[PDB]
Symmetry: C7
Subunit: 80 residues, 7 copies
């Protein structure tokens, strides 16, 4: 079977995901694009304070660099 | 033949604890892993470091291996 | 053909917001970019993270891609 | 003749070691495997507060990533 | 037709620039040299407290390592 | 006639050295082995409070990962 | 031929100040350097950042180039 963590990211295409960065900040938006570096493009992205549902800021369509990602919640829509 | 990374495959479908560089602890069932130690965990709960106090639920998570400190590969068997 | 880096090219000559590793935010018109996400911004203002409180003005800046957290590539159409 | 730091890690196999990571936390356990990048597997691993013998948490069998290791006390067994 | 970020660093040669480093500190001086990795030589370099005009220390002629640079204000002279 | 920084590390073999790690802590011991990546083996390693002489912990024979070293005092024995 | 790394070579046998990523400053006579900016300083004294307060003496030190923020290659003219 060919399943590996990277292609699991492709299944999240056009779904709401949560991205947490190395500084602990959390960003929620719809995953529009991703590449093999885990560079992401998120649509209608809102930053939330860590571990909470408190919106901090809206940033629109964001390109997130993969090297500073801690993790991506790929099923986040089904859980919000 | 045995090496640290093959030990990671023995934890597939088992509950593991992953500690990241910032000290926070994530507990979940190991679904997938690769050679760089990127992981996919199912039903992932973040705990406050050193405790069993849950702080957040994140569902199915892709964790980047570069930020991992260690993985408790038999965590199921010690709780 | 769509991918993250090409989406950056769509923001050329538009105002973007760039957040760096230390959390600081910089807003200015994207004049140039390369494959490593080095950017040149014009009329760049730094803002306190998460606000519209101006902190400093830096003129035309060359931002090193390796220390960028993210780029809001549609910032002009929402600010 | 052939003596180098990474070979000295081979003589600690199945001995108790102390591993200190980049955030100053110390982990004690029996070294079961190591590779060339200093990835480690420890059995019966206990975290202790830095500089002390106050145990903080028990983690069982752990795979430690080499890149965040500060040092390994390779003769810890014979001293603690 | 050839416009790239690093080429614009070459336009600032012999001009006063502001370099902000990863720790937030700001260094002002005349750019004398740069290379492809963004290593720089500044002449008559003064550090300023971040976002102010309070000088904190003088360092003279400095070789700055590119990997810790956040940004360079390549036209800082025109705006003082 | 050939002199470079890594070769100067070999001159400290069998001498007491001080190693400062990137979290600021200092470790003093007799350098027994080293390699091209500045991985080190120290014998009789004592950690000291940064910048002081107050011992903090003993760790015996330690393998130090070169990538997390700030500097090595290669003549410390002659000035301690 | 002039470039930033060759400018380090000109500092040989000169007193330099080396600032590391954690902000600590180290002053000594530059004895050796290489292409990665690994340095050997003679008679090295560490100073509290931005001040003249000596904190510790370290003799002959080998500094790893990867943790260096900057090197004042002419520092005796500044002391």
């Amino acid at each position: 079977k060919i399943e590996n963590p990277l292609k699991s990211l492709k299944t999240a295409l056009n779904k709401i995901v949560l991205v947490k960065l190395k500084n602990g900040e959390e960003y929620v938006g719809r995953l529009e694009q991703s590449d093999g570096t885990m560079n992401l493009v998120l649509k209608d992205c809102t930053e939330y304070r860590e571990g909470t549902s408190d919106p901090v800021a809206k940033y629109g369509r964001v390109l997130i660099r993969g090297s500073n990602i801690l993790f991506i919640s790929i099923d986040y829509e089904s859980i919000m």
